[PDB]
């Protein structure tokens, strides 16, 4: 995937898809008020 290797089974229903779909190259994005006292 650019950095590491991901191991995958080859299932019979995996027939129509590329190999690169099964190793995602990016990680998902996972992303206190003033009150005056005087």
């Amino acid at each position: 995937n650019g950095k590491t290797f991901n191991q995958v089974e080859i299932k019979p229903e995996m027939i129509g898809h590329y190999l690169g779909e099964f190793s995602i190259t990016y990680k998902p994005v996972k992303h206190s008020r003033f009150i005056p006292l005087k």
Binding site: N1, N6, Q7
Partner: peptide, 22 residues
């Protein structure tokens, strides 16, 4: 009389899945 106490007297993931893919 003072005493000679110089010190204190008181004592769910598949097998081949990488950490990235996980």
């Amino acid at each position: 009389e003072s005493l000679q106490a110089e010190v204190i007297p008181d004592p769910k993931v598949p097998k081949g899945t990488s950490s990235y893919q996980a």
